[PDB]
């Protein structure tokens, strides 16, 4: 309860950490944690040539002040010391090595009170307007004397260490750089009982890496139109709905976070919203769900590939599926021969016979995505027929309107062929997608009529994200937004335990997708023209706990 | 005058006002304004038996206190008067109501629980009463009782007269004004509010209570004469544009009444804010028609049909054409003349020789619109020939199928009605904008999503909202369910360059509470509806706007 230094004098640490080159630590079964991000420097410079968005973030935090909050901080600080009574600046503190690695033309740091820690070096040795100190104790005395907003520790491996050892840091402002480099200095392992994440930013691309910004907080061990809001909330109900079956104690960490801006939260929050406010319902499968109806998610494919990080996911299978679609295939055996089993259960003798498809060969799935994308309208015979120049080739159509009529509002691909639903092994979930083109950029809306949140939505996001990059590249456009519209959104009763676990995981920065740039026609991609870079993830989860 | 009277003592009016029956006019050609809502009382009661949500609200606005904001208010109060006024353990609000008003309440609920009650009169005095209650005699005598009392905020309940005067004399800071959207006979009316003194700053959601709609609004007195994580917020915003892009074509000063309002909770703002987003941040693009648009991609609107019918009130819309279009669609029709011989011109331009010829449909008769929505709803996949052919029992009767699925398998996720038939697209006059709707059922209630590939926000979307909101009602009734939500998903969402000026006007108007839709309850099959089975009640609206202001 009694006041600790770091509160009084508002001491904070700010770092940028990349991932560190290790050989023989097989990228095949790499385990990932908070400590994955820990690279501060190499040979006395930064690990990376120039990540300009961290530079800009860094200057923004370390130079920002609120004059109208200064009086409060002064009272709070004078009242601590049994005392009383140009522009306000922040103080910044750094070690000697750090300072010696910054070029003359940038020191002393503009618009900030610079302070060096150093046993050896001394003040007669500096031309510059800078404070020298030789014990952390001396910084306290100094902050006592100066007029300043906030104090920031800009590091040094060693400086971070001891300010963290002595609990002097009230918050860490940590940039996770999602890229690997050669490093010789490292950020201390953070004690998860002393510091815990309270905030996560949006994910960005700068200079060919993704990255985000998190905040650790130290763990405890007119003002009038505010009544007008209360008045409007007068119809604030009894309590919640699933406050009986689902406990908000089950999401301790999910809820501990103040700012949850990482876009993986457009998925996670929908999950939480169905758990807390789902409608309880039977379904075709019998298993049962909580459902709601009608959501939209948006992913900026210019900044990142939205491969969920709160559990593991592999893409081989869904790319093959995507290429099978494009090829116009309806033969289930093609996929089983590549050890992809996404459609295995929909093409068994027993399954087909439940659909009343008695005269259908095993693994002949009928007029499904592939067939509708390349031959909408044609009469389906069997999966081995030659269907060339039969039906409407929707796919070639929309590649031509994107290239030649980009302002068209009719660039749609539709799998929901009312006349063939009954002949499909089963009716398509991804009803359709619509394209939009502006300024050499392609965005894509995909409407999903039925959305298994636990297990299928994650893959589906990835699936139509990749498909958007493919279309954009064969049309000489850049991808912009994949937009995911969800109709019947539901969580299956057997996913609830895995999903309670998943929503208490904190996201990592997303990876990026690279396609072989040489592929100029939608029909010419192969599995090897696709690479996933910098996929950092939590543990695989078994969405169902029986198997 | 160094701090204002009403400011210091926190004087607030709270009222509820219904509409009033004029005698012999014509109600589908009447003008509306803020004044449309005046009716206070009749024969010394409420004009309405009981409106329960306005009671809940009225008590919570008068009973609600915040102990911890009091210091700042006590401080600035005693400071004004030049004095220093421990008491009733819980702090309480003053309520200030004239005799007529006091005398027309029942004494079972008197005085008003958890409120310092006051009264005005010259017929009564302290002695023939409780010590609890107070009474004054003039206006200026009130200010006096307040400063010599512990109270949070003071609320004029008044009466015609009490409101009438307090408001002459500039002693009201804010009016909490429930607009009750029905009509009743009234003797006693709330006064015309001067606009140069008071302006609306906040408008609530729209609700249904005891078979009427209503919203709560707030007028404000116009000027005449852990902050830990507030920074954390500022640091998360480090990468923002210092500029709106279409601020060179479309200026925020062109939106002064839209941006004035603090809380804009009325459901119509879901449409108006989309328009705003487009005008400020949209993308300059050309299109097929050659007018050019500002466009964006992907939005959701949601409308609670259980609480209101969402017919836009910031401009005038009519519904006969779009209902006859709905009925034409349900019947399977593709003949354009059926609508022209009822003077519905919705599909006229698309059935011209000229237009059909431009679609390369040279062997199609005028007004044969091809295999459009109707045909696909009732005969999806059949061979189209001409608008007079007989299609009984050909194609898939999607409309029939979804009705059976809602009734007999309501938890299906395959209840969809699709009009985008890839095989027939080029045979259609034009391809459908309303790609599909999907249906969802829970606890005896039906909701509908509709996906729209192309959305003309200025002219089309308003009719589209209403059109599928009716349809959702129609399907719900013939499957013995209650409408819940209509959800409208927009794809290519565009504002036509010629509509910019008109929308600027429109976005600067303040919604009225929404009307309601009534269907004849005998109708139990989707084929049996006729025009006469649909009644719009209590449509209050601004004046018509020609969106094209060329003619
Ligand atoms: N990416 C990032 O956010 C980030 C942040 C910081 C640093 N870095 C990198 O890491 C490198 C330096 O790492 P480092 O930890 O070896 O250098 P450092 O911690 O910046 O500075 C070490 C020096 O500061 C002094 N010092 C530390 N604690 C002290 C105390 N209690 N009293 C007096 N003096 C004290 C000592 O000065 P004497 O030598 O004079 O005793 C010591 O040599 C840099 O060149 C840079 O590339 C990166
Ligand atoms: C921007 C790097 C960074 N990001 C974050 N988030 N936290 C930090 N503590 C740091 C950090 C700050 C200083 C530091 O000193 C080691 C020296 C190598 O780092 C440099 C050197 C020069 C510059 C530089 C530059 N390249 N260009 C300009 N204009 N100004 C500056 C100085 C602010 C930036 C960092 C190391 C890390
Ligand atoms: C609650 C109605 C209302 N709403 C709003 N928004 N503003 C107002 N000024 C008023 C209001 C207007 C005039 C008025 O004057 C007397 C005529 C009202 O007659 C009443 C009022 C309340 C009740 C009543 C009731 N029926 N039930 C309870 N529990 N408590 C009460 C006392 C408020 C019965 C009759 C009282 C309140
Ligand atoms: O890519 C897919 C494919 C299938 N499903 C799910 C949704 C439903 O749980 C089930 C299909 O159920 P029906 O909607 O066909 O009833 O499969 C997905 O979520 N994503
Ligand atoms: O019910 C309708 C019908 C049409 N449109 C508009 C959208 C476009 O402005 C135009 C159709 O143009 P294309 O998108 O087909 O080019 O009509 C609507 O908004 N609602």
Count of C-beta atoms within a 10 Å radius of residue A287: 12
**Which of A337, A87, A68, A54 lies closest to A209 in space, CA to CA?**
A54
The answer to whether the beta carbons of residues B453 and A401 sit under 8 Å apart is: no
SS3 A141: helix
**How do beta strands A441-452 and A430-438 pair?**
antiparallel
Residues of A in contact with B380 (CB under 8 A): 418-419
Structure tokens at B157: 């309940």
Q: Is A405 in the pocket of ligand 5 (CB under 6 A)?
A: no
Chain A: nearest CA to B503, how far in angstroms? 22
Q: Do B492 and A213 touch (CB under 8 A)?
A: no
Q: With a CB-CB cutoff of 8 Å, which residues 21-50 of chain A face chain B?
A: none
List all residues 6 or more positions away from A62 whose beta carbon is below 8 Å from its beta carbon: A14, A90, A92, A109, A112, A152, A154
Q: Do B418 and A414 touch (CB under 8 A)?
A: yes
CA A27 → CA A18, A235, A512, B164, B275, distances in Å? 16, 54, 16, 79, 49
Domains annotated on chain B, with CATH: 1-222 (3.40.430.10), 226-266 (6.10.250.2210), 267-551 (3.30.572.10)
Which of A92, A106, A185, when mutated, tests ligand 2's pocket best, judged by the most ligand atoms within 8 Å of its CB? A106
Residues of B in contact with A60 (CB under 8 A): 235, 238
CA B208 → CA A248, A412, B53, B320, distances in Å? 31, 40, 8, 25
Determine the Cα–Cα distance for residues B191 and B196; give it in Å rounded to an integer.
15
Q: DSSP letters of B353-403? A: HHHHHHTT-TTS-TTB--S-HHHHHHHBTSPP--TTS--TT-SB-HHHHHH
Determine the Cα–Cα distance for residues A496 and A543; give it in Å rounded to an integer.
8
| Local structure of residue B528 (DSSP, 8 states) | G
Structure tokens at B54: 């306005």
CA-based nearest residue in chain A for residue B283:
A438
Cite the active site residues of A: 429
A60 appears as a binding residue in the annotation: no
Q: Within an 8 Å CB–CB cutoff, is residue A157 touching chain B?
A: no
Structure tokens at B199: 């302006």
Method: X-ray
Ligand 2 atom 29: residue of nearest CA? A106
Helix/strand/coil (H/E/C) assignment for every residue in B417-462:
EECCCCCCHHHCCCCCCEEEEEEEEECCEEEEEEEEEEEECCCHHH
CA A254 → CA A34, A199, A501, B316, distances in Å? 16, 11, 10, 46
Report the residue of B413, B425, B468, B493 to disrupt the A interface, i.e. the one with the largest count of A CBs within 10 Å: B413
**Which of B18, B134, B497 lies closest to B294 in space, CA to CA?**
B497
Determine the Cα–Cα distance for residues A317 and A527; give it in Å rounded to an integer.
9
Determine the Cα–Cα distance for residues B96 and A382; give it in Å rounded to an integer.
83
Determine the Cα–Cα distance for residues B430 and B420; give it in Å rounded to an integer.
11
Determine the Cα–Cα distance for residues A439 and B282; give it in Å rounded to an integer.
12
Structure tokens at B406: 């809602």
Q: With a CB-CB cutoff of 8 Å, which residues 290-309 of chain A face chain B?
A: 291, 293-296, 298
Determine the Cα–Cα distance for residues A161 and A187; give it in Å rounded to an integer.
8
List all residues 6 or more positions away from A165 whose beta carbon is below 8 Å from its beta carbon: none
Structure tokens at A334: 């093609």
List all residues 6 or more positions away from B210 whose beta carbon is below 8 Å from its beta carbon: B48, B49, B50, B51, B52, B53
**What phi, psi does B15 have (nearest 5°)?**
-135, 165
- Position in ligand 4 atom list of the atom nearest CA A452: 19
**Which of A539, A512, A507, A455 lies closest to A264 in space, CA to CA?**
A507
SS3 B283: strand
**Which of B178, B139, B170 lies closest to B57 in space, CA to CA?**
B178
Instruction: Using alpha carbons only, give the angle B306, B309, B310 rounded to the nearest 5 degrees.
Output: 120
The answer to whether the peptide bond before residue A19 is cis (omega within 30 degrees of 0) is no
Burial of A351 (0-12, 13-18, 19+ CB in 10 A): middle
Determine the Cα–Cα distance for residues A479 and A302; give it in Å rounded to an integer.
6
Q: With a CB-CB cutoff of 8 Å, which residues 395-434 of chain B face chain A?
A: 395-396, 398, 411-414, 416, 418, 420-423, 431
The answer to whether the beta carbons of residues A494 and A546 sit under 8 Å apart is: yes
CA B419 → CA A90, A161, B105, B399, B453, distances in Å? 62, 65, 59, 11, 12
List all residues 6 or more positions away from B105 whose beta carbon is below 8 Å from its beta carbon: none
Burial of A446 (0-12, 13-18, 19+ CB in 10 A): buried
List all residues 6 or more positions away from B341 whose beta carbon is below 8 Å from its beta carbon: none
The answer to whether the beta carbons of residues A283 and B411 sit under 8 Å apart is: yes
CA-based nearest residue in chain B for residue A291:
B442
Q: Is A102 in the pocket of ligand 2 (CB under 6 A)?
A: yes
List all residues 6 or more positions away from A448 whose beta carbon is below 8 Å from its beta carbon: A429, A430, A431, A457, A460, A484, A485, A486, A487
Closest Cβ opposite residue A412 in set B66, B420, B443: B420
The answer to whether the beta carbons of residues A107 and A114 sit under 8 Å apart is: yes
The answer to whether the beta carbons of residues B153 and B93 sit under 8 Å apart is: yes
Determine the Cα–Cα distance for residues B161 and B98; give it in Å rounded to an integer.
8
Determine the Cα–Cα distance for residues A540 and A265; give it in Å rounded to an integer.
18
Q: Where are the beta strands (DSSP E) in A63-208?
A: 90-95, 112-117, 131-133, 151-153, 171-181, 185-186, 195-200, 204-206
Ligand 4 atom 16: residue of nearest CA? B413
Count of C-beta atoms within a 10 Å radius of residue A244: 8
Residues of B in contact with A225 (CB under 8 A): 202, 262
Q: Do B491 and A449 touch (CB under 8 A)?
A: no
Closest Cβ opposite residue A449 in set B286, B413, B492: B413
Distance from CA of residue B26 to its chain's centroid?
24
Q: Which helix (H) or strand (E) holds A397?
A: helix A394-404
Q: Do B489 and A296 touch (CB under 8 A)?
A: yes
Q: Within an 8 Å CB–CB cutoff, is residue B216 touching chain A?
A: yes
The answer to whether the beta carbons of residues A93 and A71 sit under 8 Å apart is: no
**Which of B63, B99, B544, B423 lies closest to A391 in space, CA to CA?**
B423
Q: Do A64 and B231 touch (CB under 8 A)?
A: yes
A vs B, Cβ pairs < 8 A, gives 189
Which runs of consecutive H residues, i.e. helices, occur in A376-417? 394-404
Determine the Cα–Cα distance for residues B125 and B523; give it in Å rounded to an integer.
62
The sign of the dihedral angle between the CA atoms of A78, A79, A85, A88 is positive
Q: How far is the CA of B480 from the centre of ligand 1 (A)?
A: 74
Structure tokens at B30: 């009447």
SS3 B16: strand
Q: Is A45 in the pocket of ligand 1 (CB under 6 A)?
A: yes
The answer to whether the peptide bond before residue B111 is cis (omega within 30 degrees of 0) is yes
Q: Do B398 and A418 touch (CB under 8 A)?
A: yes
Q: Do A228 and B299 touch (CB under 8 A)?
A: no
List all residues 6 or more positions away from A537 whose beta carbon is below 8 Å from its beta carbon: A32, A308, A309, A310, A311, A312, A313, A508
Determine the Cα–Cα distance for residues B27 and B23; give it in Å rounded to an integer.
11
Q: Within an 8 Å CB–CB cutoff, is residue A286 touching chain B?
A: no
Determine the Cα–Cα distance for residues B305 and B485; give it in Å rounded to an integer.
6
Burial of A313 (0-12, 13-18, 19+ CB in 10 A): middle
Determine the Cα–Cα distance for residues B64 and A72; give it in Å rounded to an integer.
30
By 3-state DSSP, what share of chain A in percent is helix, strand and coil, each rounded to 5? 30, 25, 45
Q: Within an 8 Å CB–CB cutoff, is residue A75 touching chain B?
A: no
Q: Which helix (H) or strand (E) holds A421?
A: none
The answer to whether the beta carbons of residues A296 and A485 sit under 8 Å apart is: yes
Q: How far is the CA of A160 from the centre of ligand 1 (A)?
A: 8
Chain A: nearest CA to B78, how far in angstroms? 19
């Amino acid at each position: 309860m009694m006041e600790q230094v770091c509160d009084v004098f508002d001491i904070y640490a700010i770092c940028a950490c990349c991932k560190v080159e290790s050989k023989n630590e097989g990228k095949k079964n790499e385990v990932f944690n908070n400590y994955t991000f820990r690279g501060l420097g190499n040979k006395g410079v930064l690990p990376w040539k120039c990540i300009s968005l961290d530079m800009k973030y860094f200057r923004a935090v370390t130079t920002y002040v609120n004059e109208s909050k200064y009086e409060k901080l002064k009272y709070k600080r004078c009242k601590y010391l049994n005392k009383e009574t140009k522009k306000l600046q922040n103080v910044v503190v750094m070690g000697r090595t750090n300072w010696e690695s910054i070029p003359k033309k940038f020191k002393p740091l503009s618009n900030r009170i610079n302070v060096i820690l150093s046993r050896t070096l001394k003040k007669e040795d500096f031309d510059e307007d800078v404070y020298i100190i030789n014990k952390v104790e001396d910084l306290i005395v100094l902050l006592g004397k100066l007029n300043y907003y906030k104090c920031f520790i800009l590091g040094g491996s060693v400086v971070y260490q001891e300010f963290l050892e002595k609990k002097l840091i009230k918050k860490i402002y940590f940039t996770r750089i999602n890229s690997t480099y050669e490093c010789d200095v490292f950020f201390p392992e953070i004690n998860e009982n002393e510091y815990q994440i309270i905030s996560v930013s949006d994910v960005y691309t700068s200079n060919n890496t993704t990255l985000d910004f998190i905040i650790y907080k130290k763990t405890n061990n007119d003002d009038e139109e505010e009544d007008d809001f209360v008045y409007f909330n007068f119809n604030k109900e009894k309590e919640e709905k699933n406050k009986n079956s689902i406990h908000p104690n089950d999401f301790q960490i999910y809820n501990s976070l103040k700012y949850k801006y990482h876009p993986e939260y457009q998925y996670l929050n929908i999950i939480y919203d169905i758990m807390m406010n789902g409608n309880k319902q039977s379904d075709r499968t019998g298993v049962g769900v909580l459902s709601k109806f009608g959501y939209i998610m948006k992913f900026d494919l210019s900044q990142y590939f939205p491969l969920l990080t709160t559990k593991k996911l592999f893409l081989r299978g869904i790319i093959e599926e995507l290429l099978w679609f494009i090829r116009g295939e309806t033969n289930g055996n093609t996929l089983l021969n590549k050890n992809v089993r996404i459609w295995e259960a929909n093409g068994t003798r027993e399954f087909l016979d439940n659909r009343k498809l008695f005269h259908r060969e095993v693994n002949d799935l009928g007029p499904i995505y592939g067939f509708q994308w390349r031959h909408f309208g044609a009469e389906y015979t069997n999966m081995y027929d030659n269907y060339e120049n039969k039906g409407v080739d929707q796919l070639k159509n929309i590649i031509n309107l994107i290239k030649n009529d980009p302002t068209s509002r009719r660039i749609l691909l539709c799998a929901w062929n009312v006349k063939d639903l009954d002949q499909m092994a089963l009716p398509p979930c991804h009803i359709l997608c619509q394209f939009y083109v502006f300024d050499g950029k392609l965005s894509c809306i995909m409407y999903q009529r039925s959305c298994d949140l636990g297990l299928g939505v994650p893959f589906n996001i990835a699936s139509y994200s990749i498909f958007t990059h493919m279309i954009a590249q064969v049309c000489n456009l850049q991808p912009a937004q994949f937009i995911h519209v969800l109709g019947n959104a539901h969580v299956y009763n057997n996913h609830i335990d895995s999903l309670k676990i998943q929503l208490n995981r904190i996201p990592y920065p997303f990876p990026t997708l690279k396609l072989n740039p040489d592929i100029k026609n939608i029909e010419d991609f192969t599995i090897s023209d696709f690479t996933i870079q910098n996929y950092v993830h939590h543990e695989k989860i078994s969405m169902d706990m029986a198997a």
